[PDB]
Write a protein that binds this ligand. Sequence first.
Ligand SMILES: C[Se][C@@H]1O[C@@H](C)[C@@H](O)[C@@H](O)[C@@H]1O
Ligand SMILES: C[Se][C@@H]1O[C@@H](C)[C@@H](O)[C@@H](O)[C@@H]1O
Ligand SMILES: C[Se][C@@H]1O[C@@H](C)[C@@H](O)[C@@H](O)[C@@H]1O
Ligand SMILES: C[Se][C@@H]1O[C@@H](C)[C@@H](O)[C@@H](O)[C@@H]1O
Ligand SMILES: C[Se][C@@H]1O[C@@H](C)[C@@H](O)[C@@H](O)[C@@H]1O
Ligand SMILES: C[Se][C@@H]1O[C@@H](C)[C@@H](O)[C@@H](O)[C@@H]1O
Ligand SMILES: C[Se][C@@H]1O[C@@H](C)[C@@H](O)[C@@H](O)[C@@H]1O
Ligand SMILES: C[Se][C@@H]1O[C@@H](C)[C@@H](O)[C@@H](O)[C@@H]1O
Ligand SMILES: C[Se][C@@H]1O[C@@H](C)[C@@H](O)[C@@H](O)[C@@H]1O
Ligand SMILES: C[Se][C@@H]1O[C@@H](C)[C@@H](O)[C@@H](O)[C@@H]1O
Ligand SMILES: C[Se][C@@H]1O[C@@H](C)[C@@H](O)[C@@H](O)[C@@H]1O
Ligand SMILES: C[Se][C@@H]1O[C@@H](C)[C@@H](O)[C@@H](O)[C@@H]1O
Ligand SMILES: C[Se][C@@H]1O[C@@H](C)[C@@H](O)[C@@H](O)[C@@H]1O
Lengths: 314, 314
Amino acid sequence: STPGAQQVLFRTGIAAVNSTNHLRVYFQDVYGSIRESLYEGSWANGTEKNVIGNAKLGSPVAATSKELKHIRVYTLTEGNTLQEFAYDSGTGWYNGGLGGAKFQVAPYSXIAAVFLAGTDALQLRIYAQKPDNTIQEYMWNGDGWKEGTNLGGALPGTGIGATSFRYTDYNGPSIRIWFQTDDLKLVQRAYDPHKGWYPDLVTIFDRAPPRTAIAATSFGAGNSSIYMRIYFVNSDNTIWQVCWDHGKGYHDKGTITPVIQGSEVAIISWGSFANNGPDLRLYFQNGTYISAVSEWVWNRAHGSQLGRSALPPA
Amino acid sequence: STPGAQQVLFRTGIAAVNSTNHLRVYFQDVYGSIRESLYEGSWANGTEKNVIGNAKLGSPVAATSKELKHIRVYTLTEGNTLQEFAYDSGTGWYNGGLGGAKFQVAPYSXIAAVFLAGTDALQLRIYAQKPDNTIQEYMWNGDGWKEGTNLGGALPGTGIGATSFRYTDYNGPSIRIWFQTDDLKLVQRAYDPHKGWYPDLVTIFDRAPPRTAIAATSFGAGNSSIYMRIYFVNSDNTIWQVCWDHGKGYHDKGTITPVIQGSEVAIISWGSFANNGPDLRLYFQNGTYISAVSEWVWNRAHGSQLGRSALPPA
Ligand SMILES: C[Se][C@@H]1O[C@@H](C)[C@@H](O)[C@@H](O)[C@@H]1O
Ligand SMILES: C[Se][C@@H]1O[C@@H](C)[C@@H](O)[C@@H](O)[C@@H]1O
Ligand SMILES: C[Se][C@@H]1O[C@@H](C)[C@@H](O)[C@@H](O)[C@@H]1O
Ligand SMILES: C[Se][C@@H]1O[C@@H](C)[C@@H](O)[C@@H](O)[C@@H]1O
Ligand SMILES: C[Se][C@@H]1O[C@@H](C)[C@@H](O)[C@@H](O)[C@@H]1O
Ligand SMILES: C[Se][C@@H]1O[C@@H](C)[C@@H](O)[C@@H](O)[C@@H]1O
Ligand SMILES: C[Se][C@@H]1O[C@@H](C)[C@@H](O)[C@@H](O)[C@@H]1O
Ligand SMILES: C[Se][C@@H]1O[C@@H](C)[C@@H](O)[C@@H](O)[C@@H]1O
Ligand SMILES: C[Se][C@@H]1O[C@@H](C)[C@@H](O)[C@@H](O)[C@@H]1O
Ligand SMILES: C[Se][C@@H]1O[C@@H](C)[C@@H](O)[C@@H](O)[C@@H]1O
Ligand SMILES: C[Se][C@@H]1O[C@@H](C)[C@@H](O)[C@@H](O)[C@@H]1O
Ligand SMILES: C[Se][C@@H]1O[C@@H](C)[C@@H](O)[C@@H](O)[C@@H]1O
Ligand SMILES: C[Se][C@@H]1O[C@@H](C)[C@@H](O)[C@@H](O)[C@@H]1O
């Protein structure tokens, strides 16, 4: 191992944000602090001087951004309430408003977060699991936090993946979320502005490990067209990918890379097939230096490759 | 799931003690409390009424006993010091002396504990991992806690299994400990009263998952003879067993039962092959009610069988 790597919690929550190839990765240290590693042409930070706040040990870690102008990082307090660390350009980091709402969730809740796509306005949708095991949406539309739509029952401790995109022919945002049901299937719920939350539940995987990690991205929005990728940890102790491609729908799935038992997973993307992309980066633990966070890369130049072996502070 | 099963921490530390078929099982709830479930002709307890103390979330949990007259349960404080919850018949539960010594260990340390075999005196040996990744023994011999032997380097966050037995031709106790080295092998170290700690590490398994759980038991001590069993979680997401049997040594190993990715494991035993035994009981998580603790049984009557499907409070 390395002393650095030993600072990273084993099975830490992991989240990532980006503006194209300018990246940030969030994780929890063994003391419960949430730290930020950074990529601006090289890997940096992730040290005890790069702490953005504290959360209960073992907390979920979620993040979403508008480029690197606005970053929001979501975790659980010791009281199992949702909280938010906020970065705005020209201010820096501060404690966001979410914590003050004291939204209480199940102690084993995961979190997913999106800024709504295709507007300049800062609108947020956060997803977590209430004590009754339902998935609840929480909303910020610029005038205070309030509950949004309740999306129904899920497996207690389900992972939650989320993405927002805006079709170029629509005048409002779309949302897709994924989670696991009691029967262990992985499913999608979907929001479009005309149909609202669709009264359906699309199965994307028939049977996954209980409380498997779930992470999702989308790219290449067009006229009534989108590309999506959902990742989870399968029973083979590897991350699997599920693909949605416009014109084919949910048409393929398969193994991507090995991970430790119970690894968490984060995904970021940029670009699209139409612009010499997309680019994908996954973050996870695969046993490098025992507890370091590792990266997997997809790009048009070289396809599927392992990226940075061990993120800072390793 | 069930409301009770939802209180059990997913990947909780697990420990167990017994006097023959009178059983106690310790685990951590989602709030960090350490709870006791019991078997006295039937299963009970494990509720908010059966809390014995508090420990850092995700703490190791180890326990040892002299029958059910003296029980000691070891975990980490938020400060990463060793602490002890103690039960003595008549006294009940109390905060043991160990905490006062403020022994600082790695935040990712595991714990093993034994009462030394073959004496009525209360003599304890506790094993944990220091920040320099060495395995340290801590001793109680009736006059305060002291550091004992340091057993050298180990993989950071290694599991630690321990047992003590007394050969019927010896005049003092033996100790065996197992842990994982940086190369990912699982090794034994051994103490006997004529040799002290043997200089050599003995490999019991060539390659195991990093930071796999390790738990051990022994039974059937005779003249220069013993039987031992060591359990760990393999890369196939099952508990494997490693067998020492007198006259054959370390001669077999294999899978026992499936578990959740990253399950912890506890083992208790009683009786012997000579006297229509032994009895073995393993405790682990295998996904029953998502987060319940389950039991596996070995006995002469029926051999290998699943036992209680979901321990109390499930
Ligand atoms: C073309 Se270098 C490649 O992409 C960068 C944006 C980073 O993800 C880096 O770790 C990786 O090796
Ligand atoms: C321009 Se300051 C730099 O980039 C911001 C987007 C944040 O990630 C901050 O923590 C970092 O130090
Ligand atoms: C100056 Se409001 C700030 O930004 C919004 C987009 C929300 O994240 C809110 O909780 C936060 O405090
Ligand atoms: C407008 Se949200 C309000 O102001 C922000 C700047 C933060 O202090 C946040 O915690 C608070 O709830
Ligand atoms: C305009 Se309805 C409002 O915003 C949508 C984008 C969804 O988050 C929905 O659940 C919410 O009630
Ligand atoms: C009108 Se297809 C709609 O949007 C796609 C992008 C998918 O999420 C599909 O499951 C959904 O029903
Ligand atoms: C046309 Se390759 C397809 O799309 C890429 C964006 C990656 O998700 C890759 O894993 C997949 O097989
Ligand atoms: C002969 Se019942 C058998 O043994 C008891 C001692 C308990 O382990 C119980 O759960 C098991 O089914
Ligand atoms: C006779 Se009290 C009963 O048995 C003791 C040995 C302990 O396990 C205690 O917690 C339990 O309530
Ligand atoms: C009446 Se001392 C009591 O029992 C000893 C055996 C030790 O476990 C010690 O730490 C504890 O406080
Ligand atoms: C009699 Se030496 C004393 O007790 C032995 C049983 C071992 O625990 C050893 O490490 C310790 O120094
Ligand atoms: C004099 Se064999 C001695 O004791 C056995 C019980 C085993 O632990 C073995 O590895 C060790 O060398
Ligand atoms: C004589 Se069967 C042998 O010993 C029992 C005590 C159990 O450990 C069993 O799994 C093993 O195969």
